[PDB]
Write an enzyme that holds these catalytic residues in place. Structure first.
Site: not given
Ligand SMILES: C/C(=C\Cc1c(C)c(O)c2ccccc2c1O)CCC[C@H](C)CCC[C@H](C)CCCC(C)C
Ligand SMILES: CCCCCCCCCCCCCCCCCC(=O)O[C@H](COC(=O)CCCCCCCCCCCCCCC)COP(=O)(O)OCC[N+](C)(C)C
Ligand SMILES: CCCCCCCCCCCCCCCCCC(=O)O[C@H](COC(=O)CCCCCCCCCCCCCCC)COP(=O)(O)OCC[N+](C)(C)C
Ligand SMILES: *[C@@H]1O[C@H](CO)[C@@H](O[C@@H]2O[C@H](CO)[C@@H](O)[C@H](O)[C@H]2NC(C)=O)[C@H](O)[C@H]1NC(C)=O
Ligand SMILES: *[C@@H]1O[C@H](CO)[C@@H](O[C@@H]2O[C@H](CO)[C@@H](O)[C@H](O)[C@H]2NC(C)=O)[C@H](O)[C@H]1NC(C)=O
Ligand SMILES: *[C@@H]1O[C@H](CO)[C@@H](O)[C@H](O)[C@H]1NC(C)=O
Lengths: 35, 693
Positions: B188
């Site tokens: 990524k």
């Molecule tokens: C769609 C996304 C990642 C793709 C993905 C998926 C679907 C997986 O199943 C994975 C499983 C294992 C390893 C990697 C995987 C993976 O790469 C980003 C997700 C969207 C967004 C980043 C989620 C928001 C939640 C976080 C905690 C926000 C924290 C931000 C702070 C500033 C508060």
């Protein structure tokens, strides 16, 4: 049936309005039963 | 004693010799966490076989007598008849249940593993990362001694009842999960992920509502979704291993996976990763969880006493390592090295390379590339008469992934070559023309439209010469074009095109699409109207008003690619909308009491709302009634309680499982006791498809 072949008029249509599909290639089997 | 000893769990001197390494990799460890993970993985795959593998839909995918084009990894593989496929899925289900309950563990693991990989390799259009992960986990667990705790084999065999397991059983799984997180994170680090292009529209989901109280939508779509995801991948890879960071890592990973489950429709991937998250914890956490309960409950939960010795470990008094210990160490090292190497093995198998790298499924590049296809034309020239004809874009196919890979295109061309002679076509020559844009770029050809793919050359280990390069020079234009996208009305639409030197595009504007115009952004093109044989050479920043209902060709006559755009509005839709709006205004005027004059007779059905005892309504009136009904249906859907939706979801899943079970029963009966007369089969098939209610 006769759905294998198409026509010149309906093949050369770049400008055809349609919906949007992101197609992430990771989401289940996409439309599934449709195609 | 050493600080490194507590942090990493092993000392440096353990790596001096092969004997010490084998002893370290085969030291005793508690079996509890591995048993819990085995149970969860088996249960989730049991739930997943009737949903994602396609056992419910297997009767309309491998239907006998239907001619469809398959895309297997090896041309030698061929699907079996439908009944034997049902038997294969039954074997899968039995193996998965055996893995869940720990009953005949190695046999169950093999019975799950071999069919699963057969299905996985049979079709390249059903590949995704979370299926590859399930295959890898099933392969790993075949060798791990996971049937030592909370297993039926323990009850049936005393020697395997709450016994020790070697340490590499946990090491391989921990390494696999770390590889998943880290390689996903590093993959990524792409220009289209750090800049906010991939998943640009996912910040609108209501799960991101609290962030919008402090940040704008554009900032939330970059700081949280993209950079947050990348940092979470790398940090969740590293943090969970260390003792100090385990709590915060667990919290962030659980939140990440729950949000992934709700936001996307990936399936059981989120739950599998959630089940794997505890695996980095101490190897005996379920035991201490069991101990901290009332005694009466402890009479039902598994044993809590210290595990008994096993023969799959080396104990220090000592005990010279045997053979299985050495094989275990070698398997661990070689497997993890292969796992590191395979995502970056794309320079050897160059046939599968395209704008992206390699086939999708084993690269961990999840949700990084999005594609929008604009046009697909398949032309054939008969090998006897010379006639030229055009086929449907997706004929004799079940997926739409053949549009982006050279190997699948070659297979499709060969399939069409063998099938078309059934339709009075001699030895054909098939040409393909596909327009696709990745991450909101200009639409461009992917394959050379002058190459007969039936006779073209393709080998896995040599680069294909008929795949157009990705014009990455036009990357910054994605800013300016987006501005033009936001300057339009509610009717106008725009399509951007980038074309190579020498080539041309022939297009037919429909009679509906009046008021269509072409403007040039970069390069030099010539636009030819063929009705009167007139071509005009357009310079940069010149606009032309194209005819409606004729063919026009656009030729590129510059050494470098030329970029232009089509802007069009639908006249028929606008006219229908205006007439319907006038009708609606008249209806509203009638309703509020205005327009005291008599209504037209055609308006009487509109007020009545039912076509009874009168002339049939005009098509406009039918369209108005349909629009009103659809609007009422949408409004009813919006004002719907949650509990009804939950009950409907449960009923639908019940229907899926019921259909799977009944159809498998029919297939097995046909295999064993033969096929009855057709009437009984029809009655049974009608019975199976019945909704549960
Ligand atoms: C769609 C996304 C990642 C793709 C993905 C998926 C679907 C997986 O199943 C994975 C499983 C294992 C390893 C990697 C995987 C993976 O790469 C980003 C997700 C969207 C967004 C980043 C989620 C928001 C939640 C976080 C905690 C926000 C924290 C931000 C702070 C500033 C508060
Ligand atoms: C890195 C992964 C990829 C490369 C792997 C190379 C092949 C392995 C070579 C041999 C490695 C040493 C022997 C096996 C592992 C080992 O020493 O034992 C293990 C260590 O854990 C493992 O199995 C680690 C597997 C790799 C997982 C990824 C680690 C990431 C490290 C990041 C940099 C630091 C003992 O763990 P324990 O339950 O006793 O707890 C110790 C650590 N705490 C307490 C913090 C939880
Ligand atoms: C120690 C523990 C450590 C932590 C472990 C954490 C992981 C545990 C996971 C275990 C499995 C939990 C259940 C998973 C359920 C599940 O995945 O649900 C589903 C799949 O599972 C199911 O639906 C299973 C349903 C089985 C059938 C149940 C029928 C029950 C009928 C009850 C009687 C009804 C009687 C009615 C008349 C009175 C996922 O939905 P989807 O992928 O289609 O998503 C669609 C919607 N979006 C896209 C929005 C997400
Ligand atoms: C209109 O302009 C186009 C632009 O090239 C002319 O096309 C070339 O046409 C000749 C004659 O048919 C072909 O041999 C060339 O291969 C074409 N060029 C390319 C790049 O394909 C076209 O002939 C012009 N039409 C008229 C009626 O004058
Ligand atoms: C242009 O807009 C019209 C608006 O109607 C679209 O049309 C309908 O077209 C479909 C076929 O695509 C017909 O089955 C319907 O009966 C039409 N509806 C009417 C006349 O109300 C049309 O698809 C749009 N696109 C093009 C290329 O014309
Ligand atoms: C011609 O094609 C049609 C369509 O399949 C059918 O009559 C048959 O296949 C062909 N017959 C002859 C005489 O060419």
């Amino acid at each position: 049936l006769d759905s294998v072949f198409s026509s010149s008029e309906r093949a050369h249509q770049v400008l055809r309005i349609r919906k949007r599909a992101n197609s992430f290639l990771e989401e289940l089997r996409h439309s599934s039963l449709e195609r | 004693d050493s600080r490194i000893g507590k942090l990493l769990g092993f000392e440096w001197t353990d790596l001096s010799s092969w004997r010490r390494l084998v002893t370290l990799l085969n030291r005793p460890t508690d079996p509890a966490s591995l048993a819990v993970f085995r149970f969860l993985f088996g249960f989730l795959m049991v739930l997943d076989i009737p949903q994602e593998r396609g056992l419910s839909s297997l009767d309309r995918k491998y239907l006998d007598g239907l001619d469809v084009c398959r895309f297997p990894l090896l041309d030698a593989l061929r699907p079996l008849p439908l009944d034997w496929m049902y038997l294969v899925y039954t074997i899968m289900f039995l193996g998965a249940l055996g893995m869940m309950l720990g009953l005949c563990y190695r046999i169950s693991c093999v019975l799950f593993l071999l069919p699963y990989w057969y299905v996985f390799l049979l079709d390249k259009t059903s590949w995704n990362n979370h299926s590859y992960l399930y295959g890898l986990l099933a392969f790993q667990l075949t060798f791990m001694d996971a049937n030592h705790y909370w297993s039926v084999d323990g009850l049936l065999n005393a020697h395997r009842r709450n016994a020790h397991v070697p340490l590499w059983n946990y090491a391989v799984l921990r390494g696999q999960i770390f590889i998943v997180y880290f390689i996903a994170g590093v993959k990524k680090l792409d220009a289209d992920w750090v800049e906010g292009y991939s998943m640009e529209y996912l910040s609108r989901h209501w799960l991101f509502s609290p962030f919008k109280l402090l940040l704008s939508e554009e900032l939330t779509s970059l700081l949280v979704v993209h950079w947050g995801g990348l940092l979470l991948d790398l940090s969740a890879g590293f943090l969970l291993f260390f003792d100090v960071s385990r709590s915060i890592g667990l919290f962030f990973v659980s939140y990440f996976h729950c949000m992934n489950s709700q936001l996307f429709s990936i399936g059981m991937f989120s739950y599998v990763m959630l089940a794997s998250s505890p695996l980095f914890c101490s190897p005996e956490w379920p035991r201490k969880l069991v101990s901290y309960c009332p005694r009466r409950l402890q009479q039902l939960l598994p044993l809590k006493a210290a595990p008994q010795p096993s023969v799959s470990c080396v104990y220090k008094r000592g005990q010279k390592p045997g053979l299985r210990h050495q094989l275990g160490a070698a398997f661990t090292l070689l497997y993890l090295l292969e796992q590191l190497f395979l995502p970056y093995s794309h320079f050897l198998t160059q046939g599968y390379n395209n704008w992206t790298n390699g086939l999708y499924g084993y690269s961990w590049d999840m949700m990084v590339h999005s594609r929008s296809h604009q046009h697909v034309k398949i032309t054939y020239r008969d090998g006897r008469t010379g006639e030229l004809g055009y086929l449907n874009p997706g004929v004799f196919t079940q997926s739409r992934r053949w549009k982006d890979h050279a190997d699948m295109l070659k297979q499709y061309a060969t399939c069409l070559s063998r099938l078309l002679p059934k339709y009075n076509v001699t030895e054909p020559q098939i040409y393909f023309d596909i327009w696709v844009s990745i991450n909101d770029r200009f639409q461009q050809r992917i394959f050379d439209p002058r190459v007969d793919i039936v006779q073209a050359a393709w080998s896995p280990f040599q680069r294909t010469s008929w795949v157009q390069p990705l014009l990455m020079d036009l990357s910054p234009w994605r800013a300016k074009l987006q501005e033009i996208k936001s300057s339009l009305d509610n009717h106008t639409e725009v399509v951007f095109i980038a074309d190579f030197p020498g080539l041309h595009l022939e297009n037919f504007v429909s009679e509906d699409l009046g008021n269509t115009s072409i403007q040039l952004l970069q390069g030099e093109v010539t636009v030819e109207l063929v009705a009167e044989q007139k071509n005009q050479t357009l310079r940069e920043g010149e606009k032309m008003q194209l005819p409606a209902g004729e063919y026009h060709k656009v030729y590129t006559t510059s050494p470098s690619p030329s970029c232009y755009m089509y802007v069009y509005v639908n006249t028929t839709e606008l006219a229908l909308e205006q007439d319907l709006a006038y009708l609606q205004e008249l209806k509203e005027k009638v309703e509020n009491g205005s327009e005291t004059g008599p209504l037209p007779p055609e308006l009487q059905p509109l007020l009545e709302g039912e076509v009874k005892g009168g002339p049939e309504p005009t098509p406009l009136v039918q369209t108005f009634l349909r629009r009103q009904q659809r609007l009422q249906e949408i409004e009813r859907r919006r004002n719907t309680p949650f509990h009804e939706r939950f009950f409907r979801f449960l009923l639908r899943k019940l229907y899926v499982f019921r259909r799977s079970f009944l159809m498998t029963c029919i297939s097995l009966r046909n295999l064993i006791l033969g096929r009855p007369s057709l009437e009984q089969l029809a009655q049974e098939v009608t019975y199976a498809n019945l909704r549960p209610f």
